[PDB]
Design a protein around this ligand. Structure first.
Ligand SMILES: CCCCCCCCCCCCCCCCCC(=O)OC[C@H](COP(=O)([O-])OCC(O)COP(=O)([O-])OC[C@@H](COC(=O)CCCCCCCCCCCCCCCCC)OC(=O)CCCCCCCCCCCCCCCCC)OC(=O)CCCCCCCCCCCCCCCCC
Ligand SMILES: CCCCCCCCCCCCCCCCCC(=O)OC[C@H](COP(=O)([O-])OCC[N+](C)(C)C)OC(=O)CCCCCCCCCCCCCCCCC
Ligand SMILES: CCCCCCCCCCCCCCCCCC(=O)OC[C@H](COP(=O)(O)OCCN)OC(=O)CCCCCCCCCCCCCCCCC
Ligand code: SF4
Ligand code: SF4
Ligand code: SF4
Ligand code: SF4
Ligand code: SF4
Ligand code: FES
Ligand SMILES: [K+]
Ligand SMILES: [Zn+2]
Lengths: 125, 96, 210, 48, 96, 388, 176, 113, 115, 264, 108
């Protein structure tokens, strides 16, 4: 009906990746940093996994950017930090986890701009 | 179109059709290659008033699927829809 | 049906009928059904435990009020964040009642799924496609083998972690007088674009904060 | 042009025997039609 | 504005030329390096300035919907002409 | 297993459907086992679609069943529109039915003529591609491309019909029934053709449904099923036509069904030309459909929506739909999953030829080797959609 | 609504049976098929005399690519990269910089014509009608390298074909 | 009167439709007796099975019976009864009526992720 | 939990059995393959390669991972035995065109930045 | 604590410290209110009016950025009244805005573009001519195209409160109100390049980065500044293996979201 | 023009590669090419065969058939129009017209 299997779950052998791109690759788990050119925060909701950048060179003919790295454009999206780590382990990638940085809540007051005795008074509007 | 009458008679007879009425080739029953410029109409949302996008936004009127049963959270039998209706024979050409 | 030229009209009678049948199926096969949902554009999905495939597919095919005689499609979706990353989707069609229904289940890399060929002979090639592209093994399948990929092709391309251009590429070598595979090198790397906008588009689908 | 032919043969070109210093008595190709006539010869327009 | 490098190769309007020791200039040996001879920078210089009599002038590049998007240009500054971001045409305010 | 004949159509002949490697066991002239091997035109289309916006993915659908270009587009557009919850305007729905039926004629001419060409009847092939060539001009006049129009898009159609097109389509449709009649004067009552198709590849109604067949493959066996009649999707509820139904389930009935579908397509095309309404061609909602080039160069909002539509693309609400149409070959459907962004998360293509070809072994049992050529032809297999 | 394509019942009178016997033995329908082929022999062929005659096209035809100019002679392209972003085949590669006069102009514009699917999305997306698909469809080459267009080539195509391209735009811009 | 053709390939005509159905429906009712009375499958399948069987008795004419049943040709109704019967025998082995075998992981059916 | 549905083996002993069988079928096959496919390798080189492929997966201890490894190995055999492969597929195992790739720090240091 | 009071956000109860604004109350249930003039690291302005939102049983809409919440308010961030306020305000913003998106470096990463798509209308009814503004030269680092300015006054607040420089201000009045220095001045500061990031539009752009790349084609690499010992967290933007620009990366304890001009 | 509709591989004079060459299919195409008796020419028709086209970045597609066989003429388009292919064949005829096999042989 069922069996008991306890070993650490690993699938590197059956996934089909070459060894070169399992062992020497350093996955990076993180939440993307907000693009400071915009105030929207909808791209900092999920955890991404990416790999280390490798060499790109100029194509001798047209000057295009040539790569020999098959993982260069690979990005994975996860709901939680555990999932990204759980996926990375069973595929046998060396990874680093960077903790989410949450904006610190702040005290905002409009009245603070017109202050009798404080330096927060604004000189213009 | 430039077939002599005799050859016209022959190919009509061989095929059993009046081929000249419906010629395969096109001569001067085709549209002119140069046409007058068009003046295409505008859509129903080209209005200067009473045209707020919030009252015609299809995307934002979708909602997530309803959940009829979920594990965490004398009735009569029902078919997924009323039984399909039998088709009726064409009265234009019932038997080919 | 409203005078909103650009907005798809709602059919509410279809929504009611599909919700009634969702309960009916849940009432009859409570051992297996894990969830029932009907979308806004009227499409019923039944989520089931992977062990109820044959009982669930058989009931929908043979029951006198189901009669989903036709398997319209069978495919898998890969969602790596889920613990059971693979979701197996069955789209069925009922010609007696002119209705469609979707049956979904899940699995992982190392859990087999019962073959539905005993129920729908159409599933023979669909499951070979699922195995080849997703590496999901179906048990008791008459003939499971690759169907799309090249012979000796290592990997399962439709997994989200398989790179778009793969790992090996073919050319002809004069010296060995045959077509040789080699590690892939692109003259122009595929350029990845970040297109997602940082502003929320659909509040109705907002997920609760952590 | 001859408008009593069927559509597609009612216009045609007889290529020059020499163009840009190349003998084209025998060797002619569809790229010898200049852009102004290219539109007329392909019936994209109705006016030479 | 097609000047040649000391080697003998023509320079392009982007300013590109193969330096003295670059092997990649072999690709042109027995063939030719294609260089457009109408330099957009030099042609748009020739255009005369357009004297106008208002502080704000709009340019669409001509042709209405066959030009570029319509842009309004400010001409208050006297030390310089006002240029179109798209088509590069210059404007000045008349005797003012 | 007297002998195994591995028949590769690698050195392809003038069929153009693709390439099929067929592995068979011939116990004499008879066929005991048939095993199609179908990886030769697998191009990874479903994975590539995940890296493209919804607009960028549309041309992939032209290149599936590459004899049903605008019908494949409509299926993608009907799926995306359903997730977007928008509606294309009434004029475009008529243009999409009109060119849906011009595409059905395009498909059946290829289906019947190349089927007959493989069985030795070469001449009707040339007769009818003079007609397909005239249909390719309608495609080019509305889209600029003879084949891969990229014309039917979510929200409607890219451009409006140029002035003078409907007259030329009417002139083509007026002379076209005679062209079909000439084709039947060479095949319908021809004893050689009937001997090659009658009682070949018989399929029972019960086995058809279970094997997943659709289209003519069902209606040849007598199943009264057409998606245009039972689950209509554009204006097909507003046009009168009859569904041809077979009685014996053999190749010859399937041949007759297709030839009768060409006549019903001309019947439908006649109604579309008369009922074509005025108005706009794409949904008047610029967060989905691009604005007119005149408005984009005049209006700030139009330029912003133009800029974003052709870069990010419109975002589609999260959800999953299975949309199917009555494609000329059969039921063509797409299972499209949206994660809420502007790029599809998963796009599974349901090709009718995938199931039909899998059903070849069933149909070939107890037939000679020369019949297999007739069986594959009557299925109408193109390997663009079989493999994707 | 359906019809029966083949549900006839053959008549079993002697007159009808003899009709089928005459057909079977005298090959009547086969002669009829020979008649149709004979009629086509005396119909005029649909062939045209390429390259002297050409198949009809329309203004919307999507052919070889070219970069256009304004009447003054300045390039229309402002390096917005909307064409590069939309290109379904990723056939376009763009680099830009400020020109010596501060203008927003490209320094690299390339189309891999062997990647391009000739869909015309790039001309639909261009805000300034800078990139177009021309009317030329006869530009096959002998080497692969001859089909990788840089900026000079596309500018030269615009100079070569502007006369026709402008007229085609004039004919269709109102539909667009 | 008797149909020459069912219209469907591989589906032959039934000489004795009324009697053939009665046997099948009665067998179905008999088989359901082996299923727990509480299970939902037994209650619903009995209800439809009885309602059809009542019509079969009531209607002697084959054409009128089909119009009441609305299951296509009368041979199609027989083919469906045989499927319901074989389904019930399989349900007794599967026992779907039991409580849920197992519940899915936390975020198994959560879309978007 | 650790309660998982099995593919075939219910413990490594059964799995190692199927592994052992599959090696028999491959060991017998190489003599035939080297002939039907007209390969230029000796039957010794072929059998060493089969040994190499089986050895690389030595560490595996999960019964389910071993079932799939065997399932895949049999599919590979079925292609070679039935001659569905071609001479090119069979010879891809030997990487006869890829030039020697170094593995010592100094060698990798001279050529490129790859770790 | 007992400080916290209870407010509802579309019927979802959240407990907030007294003095929290409506915009901050909405952020706790995960919503982002649209904005142009509000920035959490600057003084509240309340002038763009894009944050206007409806309070149930309240006839008037309130500026969510500058309105302290009171006990038992239900903030309706998606009512018809709220949506129409956003559409009206976006229309006014785009009335005089130039048609520059193809030539504007901000294109593709513009809050005006993106919030126009999400909260604005799809079409214009503005049938007049537009405003045009001359450009100011405030140094070799920031390029000014002030026709695009939406007068959010973020740059003014940043320079006054963050950089401690009072060179920037608003001269004029009404529709003619302009942002600048009045005189020929260069806003040269070690933190000057930061006003590029806070400017929501292409009014202030990086001169070195002008025209070279678009946001969607650049790969983001999170790294660290090494031009000083503060270790500012940055983003290195690259395209086809080339470094295109340096952007800040938010770190609350180090550089917040600023960087120096040597870093930039 | 003298170009037969259908030619067998071992009497053919020119191979026209009309569509996508996948990795599964590449060995078969090189097999056919070797069986062709000389003189043999290849015509690459369309983007897919020319350089991969719109599946260029696919894992299962050869990025151009010139990786497998030598190509004499490249016909652009997706698809090239029938007229565009005809122009390509007529370009092959002119390419053959300029051959100098005997003239080279004399000077060897
Ligand atoms: C074989 C036995 C029958 C011989 C009949 C010869 C003949 O004249 O038939 C064609 C002649 C034209 O047939 P058609 O299809 O009605 O004319 C089509 C166009 O209108 C034709 O009108 P068109 O204005 O286009 O004609 C112009 C045509 C001018 O030529 C002709 O129109 C007819 C030339 C055939 C002469 C014989 O130009 C040419 O092509 C002449 C160049 C040479 C072509 C080769 C003709 C010679 C073939 C015999 C060579 C060996 C002797 O036949 C008839 O007129 C029917 C009368 C019964 C004929 C028997
Ligand atoms: C049975 C009758 C049937 C009907 C008639 C059949 C056609 C007869 C008319 C055609 C005859 C053509 C003969 C040439 C054969 C083709 C040659 C060719 O293709 O080039 C390949 C070769 C080119 O030589 P090659 O050596 O460069 O080619 C091989 C190249 N490598 C080494 C790299 C592999 O041509 C020949 O071999 C020509 C052979 C001699 C031809 C006769 C020349 C005599 C005239 C010159 C002497 C005058 C002295 C005064
Ligand atoms: C070549 C010219 C062909 C003439 C055009 C075709 C034609 O006229 O034949 C049709 C004629 C009728 O045949 P059909 O339609 O089958 O109906 C007959 C009812 N028994 O079919 C016939 O009557 C043709 C009979 C020809 C006589 C038999 C052939 C004898 C051959 C030796 C002389
Ligand atoms: S026609 Fe289409 S594929 Fe070709 S360059 Fe333009 S957008 Fe790209
Ligand atoms: S060709 Fe047009 S779309 Fe492309 S970069 Fe130039 S202006 Fe922008
Ligand atoms: S600031 Fe934004 S909306 Fe204004 S022109 Fe620049 S990109 Fe377009
Ligand atoms: S320049 Fe930019 S930051 Fe300053 S007020 Fe104008 S839009 Fe706001
Ligand atoms: S038409 Fe285009 S997509 Fe199709 S095979 Fe030809 S090049 Fe490839
Ligand atoms: S964000 Fe509140 S008014 Fe500007
Ligand atoms: K800015
Ligand atoms: Zn201008």
């Amino acid at each position: 009906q069922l069996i008991t299997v306890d070993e650490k779950l690993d699938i590197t052998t059956i996934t089909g990746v070459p060894e070169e791109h399992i062992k020497t690759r350093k996955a990076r788990i993180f939440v993307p940093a907000r693009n400071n050119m915009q105030s929207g925060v909808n791209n900092t909701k999920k955890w991404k996994m990416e790999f280390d950048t490798r060499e790109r060179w100029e194509n001798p003919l047209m000057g295009w950017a040539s790569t020999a790295d098959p993982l260069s454009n690979l990005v994975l999206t996860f709901s939680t930090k555990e999932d990204a780590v759980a996926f990375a382990e069973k595929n046998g990638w060396s990874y680093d986890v960077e903790e989410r940085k949450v904006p610190k809540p702040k005290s905002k007051s409009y009245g603070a701009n017109f202050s009798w005795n404080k330096r927060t008074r604004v000189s213009t509007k | 179109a430039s077939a002599t009458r005799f050859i016209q008679w022959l190919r009509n007879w061989a095929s059993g059709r009046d081929l000249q009425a419906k010629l395969q080739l096109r001569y001067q029953e085709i549209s002119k290659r140069t046409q007058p410029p068009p003046k295409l109409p505008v859509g129903p949302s080209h209005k200067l008033s009473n045209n707020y996008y919030c009252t015609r936004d299809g995307r934002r009127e979708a909602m997530p699927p309803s959940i009829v049963m979920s594990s965490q959270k004398e009735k009569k039998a029902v078919s997924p829809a009323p039984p399909i209706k039998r088709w009726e024979l064409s009265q234009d050409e019932p038997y080919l | 049906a409203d005078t909103r030229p650009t907005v798809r009209p709602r059919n509410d009678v279809a929504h009611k009928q599909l919700s009634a049948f969702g309960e009916y199926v849940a009432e009859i096969l409570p051992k297996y059904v894990q969830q029932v949902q009907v979308s806004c554009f009227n499409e019923l999905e039944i989520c089931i435990h992977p062990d109820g495939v044959i009982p669930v597919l058989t009931f929908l095919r043979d029951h006198s009020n189901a009669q989903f005689k036709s398997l319209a499609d069978l495919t898998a979706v890969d969602i790596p964040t889920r613990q059971n990353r693979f979701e197996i989707v069955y789209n069925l069609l009922s010609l007696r009642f002119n209705s469609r229904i979707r049956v979904k289940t899940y699995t992982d890399e190392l859990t087999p799924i019962e073959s539905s060929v005993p129920v729908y002979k159409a599933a023979n090639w669909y499951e070979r496609e699922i195995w080849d592209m997703f590496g999901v093994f179906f048990a008791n399948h008459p003939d499971l083998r690759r169907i799309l990929t090249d012979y000796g092709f290592e990997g399962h391309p439709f997994r989200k972690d398989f790179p778009l251009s793969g790992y090996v590429e073919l050319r002809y070598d004069d010296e060995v007088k045959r077509v040789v595979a080699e590690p892939v090198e692109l003259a122009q790397e595929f350029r990845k674009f970040d297109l997602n906008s940082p502003w929320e588009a659909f509040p109705a689908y907002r997920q609760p904060p952590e | 042009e001859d408008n009593k032919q069927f559509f597609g043969r009612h216009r045609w070109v007889i290529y020059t025997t020499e163009m840009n210093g190349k003998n084209t008595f025998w060797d002619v190709d569809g790229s010898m039609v200049p852009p102004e006539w290219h539109r007329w010869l392909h019936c994209m327009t109705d006016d030479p | 504005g097609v000047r040649t490098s000391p080697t003998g190769e023509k320079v392009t309007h982007t300013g590109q030329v193969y330096d003295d020791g670059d092997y990649r200039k072999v690709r042109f040996v027995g063939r030719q390096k294609e260089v457009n001879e109408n330099f957009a920078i030099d042609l748009i210089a020739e255009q005369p300035v357009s004297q106008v009599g208002s502080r704000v002038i709009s340019c669409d590049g001509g042709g209405g919907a066959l030009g570029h998007p319509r842009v309004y240009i400010n001409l208050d500054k006297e030390t310089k002409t006002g240029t179109c971001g798209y088509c590069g045409l210059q404007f000045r305010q008349q005797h003012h | 297993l007297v002998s195994n004949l591995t028949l590769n159509f690698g050195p392809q002949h003038p069929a153009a459907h693709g390439v099929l490697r067929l592995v068979m066991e011939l116990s004499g002239e008879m066929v005991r086992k048939c095993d199609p091997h179908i990886g030769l035109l697998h191009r990874g289309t479903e994975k590539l679609i995940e890296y493209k916006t919804y607009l960028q993915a549309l041309p992939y659908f032209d290149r599936l069943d590459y004899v049903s270009m605008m019908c494949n587009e409509q299926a993608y557009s009907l799926a995306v529109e359903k997730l977007l919850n928008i509606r294309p305007p009434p004029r475009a729905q008529w243009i999409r039915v009109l060119f849906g039926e011009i595409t059905r004629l395009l498909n059946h001419i290829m289906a019947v003529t190349t089927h007959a060409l493989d069985i030795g009847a070469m001449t009707p092939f040339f007769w009818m591609f003079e007609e397909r060539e005239k249909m390719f001009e309608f495609y080019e006049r509305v889209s600029g491309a003879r084949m891969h129009a990229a014309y039917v898009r979510p929200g409607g159609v890219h451009q409006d019909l140029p002035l003078g097109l409907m007259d030329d389509i009417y002139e083509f449709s007026k002379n076209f029934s005679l062209r079909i009649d000439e084709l039947e004067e060479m095949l319908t009552n021809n004893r050689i053709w009937r001997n090659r198709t009658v009682d070949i590849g018989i399929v029972t109604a019960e086995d058809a449904l279970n094997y997943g067949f659709s289209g003519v493959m069902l209606r040849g066996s007598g199943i009264q099923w057409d998606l245009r009649k039972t689950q209509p999707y554009d204006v097909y509820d507003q046009v009168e036509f009859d569904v041809p139904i077979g009685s014996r389930g053999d190749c010859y009935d399937r041949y007759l069904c297709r030839v009768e579908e060409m006549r019903q397509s001309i019947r439908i095309i006649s109604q579309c030309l008369n009922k074509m309404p005025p108005g706009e061609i794409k949904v008047d909602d610029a967060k989905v459909s691009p604005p007119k080039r005149a408005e984009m160069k005049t209006s700030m909002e139009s330029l912003i929506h133009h800029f974003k539509l052709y870069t990010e693309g419109y975002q589609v609400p999260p959800g999953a739909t299975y949309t199917a149409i009555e494609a000329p070959k059969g039921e063509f459907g797409v299972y499209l999953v949206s994660d809420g962004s502007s790029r599809p998360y998963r796009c599974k293509i349901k090709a009718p030829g995938f199931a039909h070809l899998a059903g070849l072994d069933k149909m070939s049992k107890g037939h000679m080797l020369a019949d297999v050529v007739a069986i594959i032809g009557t299925q109408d297999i193109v390997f663009g959609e079989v493999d994707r | 609504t359906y019809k029966y394509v083949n549900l006839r019942e053959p008549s079993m009178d002697m007159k009808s049976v003899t009709d089928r016997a005459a057909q079977t033995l005298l090959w009547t329908e086969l002669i009829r098929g020979l008649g149709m082929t004979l009629s086509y022999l005396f119909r005029e062929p649909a062939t045209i005399n390429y390259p002297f005659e050409k198949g009809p096209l329309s203004p919307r035809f999507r052919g070889e690519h070219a970069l256009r100019r304004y009447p003054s002679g300045e390039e229309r392209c402002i390096a917005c990269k909307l064409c590069e972003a939309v290109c379904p085949a990723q056939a376009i590669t763009i680099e830009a910089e400020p020109r010596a006069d501060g203008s927003r102009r490209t320094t690299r514009y390339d189309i891999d014509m062997t990647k391009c699917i000739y869909c015309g999305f790039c001309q639909e997306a261009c805000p300034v009608d800078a990139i177009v698909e021309g009317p030329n469809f006869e530009f096959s080459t002998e080497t692969h390298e001859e089909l990788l267009y840089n900026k000079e080539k596309l500018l030269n195509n615009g100079d070569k074909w502007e006369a026709e391209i402008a007229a085609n735009i004039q004919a269709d811009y109102l539909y667009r | 009167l008797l149909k020459k053709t069912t219209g469907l390939v591989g589906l032959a005509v039934c000489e004795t439709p009324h009697e053939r159905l009665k046997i099948l429906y009665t067998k179905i009712l008999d088989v359901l007796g082996h299923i727990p009375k509480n299970a939902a499958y037994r209650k619903y399948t009995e209800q439809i099975t009885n309602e059809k069987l009542s019509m079969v008795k009531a209607e002697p004419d084959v054409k009128k019976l089909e119009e009441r049943l609305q299951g296509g040709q009368i041979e199609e109704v027989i083919l469906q009864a045989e499927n319901e019967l074989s389904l019930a025998r399989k349900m007794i082995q599967w026992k779907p009526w039991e409580p849920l075998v197992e519940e899915p992981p936390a975020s198994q059916w959560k879309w978007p992720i | 939990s650790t309660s998982v549905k099995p593919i075939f083996s219910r413990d490594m002993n059964e799995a190692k059995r199927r592994v052992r069988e599959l090696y028999r079928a491959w060991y017998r096959e190489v003599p035939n393959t080297v002939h039907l496919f007209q390969l230029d390798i000796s039957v010794k080189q072929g059998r060493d390669k089969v040994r190499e492929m089986f050895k690389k997966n030595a560490h595996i201890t999960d019964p389910r991972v071993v079932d799939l490894l065997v399932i895949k190995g049999k599919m590979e055999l079925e292609e070679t035995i039935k001659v569905w492969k071609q001479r090119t597929h069979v010879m891809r195992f030997f990487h006869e065109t890829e030039a020697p790739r170094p593995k010592d720090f100094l060698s990798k240091f001279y050529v490129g930045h790859d770790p | 604590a007992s400080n916290l009071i209870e407010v509802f956000v579309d019927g979802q109860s959240v407990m907030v410290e007294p003095g929290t604004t409506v915009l901050q109350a909405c952020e706790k249930v995960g919503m982002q209110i649209p904005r142009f003039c509000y920035h959490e690291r600057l003084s509240v302005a309340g002038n763009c009016r894009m944050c206007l939102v409806e309070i149930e049983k309240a006839p008037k809409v309130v500026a969510a950025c500058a309105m302290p919440v009171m006990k038992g308010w239900n903030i309706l961030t998606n009512s018809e009244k709220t949506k129409k306020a956003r559409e009206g305000v976006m229309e006014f913003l785009l009335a005089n805005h130039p048609l520059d998106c193809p030539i504007c470096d901000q294109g593709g990463e513009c809050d005006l573009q993106d919030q126009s798509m999400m909260f604005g209308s799809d079409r214009s009814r503005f049938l007049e001519g537009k405003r045009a503004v001359e450009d100011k030269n405030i140094g070799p680092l920031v390029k000014t195209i002030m026709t695009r300015c939406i007068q959010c006054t973020r740059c003014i607040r940043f320079a006054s409160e963050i950089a401690g420089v009072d060179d920037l201000g608003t001269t004029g009045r009404g529709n003619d109100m302009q942002v600048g220095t009045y005189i020929e001045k260069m806003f040269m500061s070690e933190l000057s390049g930061n006003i590029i990031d806070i400017c929501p539009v292409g009014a202030l752009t990086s001169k070195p980065y002008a025209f070279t790349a678009r946001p969607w084609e650049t790969r983001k690499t999170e790294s660290i500044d090494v031009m000083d010992a503060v270790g500012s967290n940055i983003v290195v933007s690259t395209r086809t293996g080339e470094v295109m620009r340096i952007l800040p990366r938010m770190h609350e304890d180090i550089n917040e979201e600023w960087i120096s001009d040597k870093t930039r | 023009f003298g170009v037969v509709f259908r030619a067998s591989p071992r009497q053919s004079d020119v191979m026209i590669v009309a569509g996508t060459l996948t990795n599964k299919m590449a060995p078969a195409l090189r097999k056919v090419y070797d069986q062709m008796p000389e003189p043999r020419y290849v015509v690459s028709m369309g983007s897919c065969a020319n350089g991969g086209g719109y599946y260029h970045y696919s894992y299962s597609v050869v990025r151009g058939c010139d990786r497998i066989v030598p190509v004499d003429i490249y016909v652009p388009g997706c698809p090239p129009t029938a007229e565009a292919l005809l122009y390509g064949i007529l370009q092959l005829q002119k390419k053959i017209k300029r051959e100098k096999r005997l003239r080279i042989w004399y000077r060897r």
